[PDB]
Amino acid sequence: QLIPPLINLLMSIEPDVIYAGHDNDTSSSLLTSLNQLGERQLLSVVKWSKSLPGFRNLHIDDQITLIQYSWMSLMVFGLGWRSYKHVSGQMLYFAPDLILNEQRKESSFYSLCLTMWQIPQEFVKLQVSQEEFLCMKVLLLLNTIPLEGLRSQTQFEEMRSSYIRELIKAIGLRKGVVSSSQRFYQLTKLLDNLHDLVKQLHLYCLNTFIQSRALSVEFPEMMSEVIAAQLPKILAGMVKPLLFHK
Amino acid sequence: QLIPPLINLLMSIEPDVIYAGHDNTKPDTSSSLLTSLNQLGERQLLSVVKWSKSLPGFRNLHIDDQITLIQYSWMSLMVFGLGWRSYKHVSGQMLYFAPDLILNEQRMKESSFYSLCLTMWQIPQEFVKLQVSQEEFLCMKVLLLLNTIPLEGLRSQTQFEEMRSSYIRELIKAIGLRQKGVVSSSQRFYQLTKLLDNLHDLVKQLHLYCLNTFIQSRALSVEFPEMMSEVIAAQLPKILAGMVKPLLFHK
Ligand SMILES: CN1CC[C@H](N(Cc2ccccc2C(F)(F)F)c2ccc(C#N)c(Cl)c2)C1
Ligand SMILES: CN1CC[C@H](N(Cc2ccccc2C(F)(F)F)c2ccc(C#N)c(Cl)c2)C1
């Protein structure tokens, strides 16, 4: 085998296809369908984390916290991948039954789609491999901690270092001390920049949630709890984002 | 007499007494306390709208700017006013929310939000310490209304800038009424404008609690009245996310 066993393991634990449940055209039905997709994505991330090496060994509260912190980040990062893989970055591939092209219009909603659109464009530009993406995804899950830190801070630190090492192996699959180091800068800078992007997504999400009755948008129960319980404190800056570059 | 005209005007358009409509004859619960506070908050908001219509300069900003400045400043103005009534009526040593909702420290302790009461209680203790005059308070309260703008600015940005600058000059005059000499009066300016800068930090804690309470309103049996609900829904997450521009007097 020439692909490292951890990257191989990560490949094997990747989620199956997730459908939004959409009727194959208003922003209420769209948001409702995006919310259903959100619920299914959250369930998928939680199940995925049960098989992710190192993660089940963290304190249970740390696990829950890290999944809640990174819910939106992992969704948008997965959106970037699918859009890149299936439509060359030129549509937003939320799910096989929810693909948004030459916009499906004019509002705040479609402005946030253009912000989300930056990530697929960046995957196309950088030509991210699946091996790189899988290691970057675990680092995204581990990319923010509480201000007081985690209960299992030592285990968390070791797990982060292991996957940073695995991203470097991932980068090594394709040559040269200066080019592989430049590419590490570029890939870890993309992760840094996601904090600023995801902040815009969290804000719109929480606003939309608190006026959901007025907008006629149904918010499923599991994702409502992450939104209700975490997004206010996150938006307020009551968490510590982790950066690779000062 | 000695009092400048605009300060006399500010005193004249100050609100009437406002009651929370709280039933003090039965024991505090967290839902009855927060529900009475929301009822008080609604009534204060209405009075801030009425007061703003009489505030020289304010009516001549774009209707959007006026709404936005009220929606940005409502919590700041409430706790500033709470601090002033507490200072004036009970020597700063109880929280005087309204004539029918007064919390001494034991009643604060027995509430579910003791830490938040102690955060609010800091303001009156500062008023006591500095011996803040009514003339300074009245100018400082207008500066709070005008103390955060959108990141992209206001529609009437020039007229806002000019309105704010006039009340800063008026605060400088209110200071001169008592503080004589360049040394004392400019230090006093530093102290009072530093107090207003610090409120940005204090209010950030109140906003987070307020927004959490709002989201959890049904589970907590805490009713949020109409106008208070729209100001929270309109701006509070944006404000908390730092997607507005707080104005500072000091770097
Ligand atoms: C209200 N929210 C909650 C979740 C849902 N959204 C987020 C979203 C979508 C479009 C535009 C704007 C946003 C914003 F709220 F985040 F800003 C969502 C759902 C599923 C996926 C996937 N896969 C993604 Cl990448 C997003 C809408
Ligand atoms: C949920 N909020 C919204 C409005 C009301 N609050 C704020 C409050 C009260 C107690 C403890 C904590 C807070 C906090 F939300 F700010 F934190 C309120 C209402 C009326 C007055 C007056 N006068 C005041 Cl000073 C506060 C309760």
From Swiss-Prot, chain B:
Domain called NR LBD: residue spans: 1-232
Where progesterone binds, per the record, is at R85
Cellular location(s): Nucleus; Cytoplasm
Which UniProt keywords are given for this protein, alphabetically ordered? Answer: Cytoplasm, DNA-binding, Isopeptide bond, Lipid-binding, Lipoprotein, Membrane, Metal-binding, Mitochondrion, Mitochondrion outer membrane, Nucleus, Palmitate, Phosphoprotein, Receptor, Steroid-binding, Transcription, Transcription regulation, Ubl conjugation, Zinc, Zinc-finger
Annotated GO biological processes are: cell-cell signaling; glandular epithelial cell maturation; lung alveolus development; maintenance of protein location in nucleus; negative regulation of gene expression; nuclear receptor-mediated steroid hormone signaling pathway; ovulation from ovarian follicle; paracrine signaling
Assigned GO CC terms: chromatin; cytosol; mitochondrial outer membrane; nucleoplasm; nucleus; plasma membrane
- Which one of the record's GO molecular function terms can you name? nuclear receptor activity
Any stretches that span the bilayer, and where are they? none
Where the protein is mainly located, per its record? nucleus
List the residue ranges forming a coiled coil, or say none: none
The segments labelled AF2 in the record are 6-251
Q: In which tissues is it expressed?
A: In reproductive tissues the expression of isoform A and isoform B varies as a consequence of developmental and hormonal status. Isoform A and isoform B are expressed in comparable levels in uterine glandular epithelium during the proliferative phase of the menstrual cycle. Expression of isoform B but not of isoform A persists in the glands during mid-secretory phase. In the stroma, isoform A is the predominant form throughout the cycle. Heterogeneous isoform expression between the glands of the endometrium basalis and functionalis is implying region-specific responses to hormonal stimuli.
Q: How is it modified after translation?
A: Phosphorylated on multiple serine sites. Several of these sites are hormone-dependent. Sumoylation is hormone-dependent and represses transcriptional activity. Sumoylation on all three sites is enhanced by PIAS3. Desumoylated by SENP1.
Job description of the protein: The steroid hormones and their receptors are involved in the regulation of eukaryotic gene expression and affect cellular proliferation and differentiation in target tissues. Depending on the isoform, progesterone receptor functions as a transcriptional activator or repressor.
**The protein's assembly and partners:** Interacts with SMARD1 and UNC45A. Interacts with CUEDC2; the interaction promotes ubiquitination, decreases sumoylation, and represses transcriptional activity. Interacts with PIAS3; the interaction promotes sumoylation of PR in a hormone-dependent manner, inhibits DNA-binding, and alters nuclear export. Interacts with PRMT2. Isoform A interacts with NCOR2. Isoform B (but not isoform A) interacts with NCOA2 and NCOA1. Isoform B (but not isoform A) interacts with KLF9. Interacts with GTF2B.
Quote the record's domain comment: Composed of three domains: a modulating N-terminal domain, a DNA-binding domain and a C-terminal ligand-binding domain.
Query: What family does the entry list?
Result: Belongs to the nuclear hormone receptor family. NR3 subfamily.
For this entry, the protein name equals Progesterone receptor
Q: Which organism is it from?
A: Homo sapiens (Human)
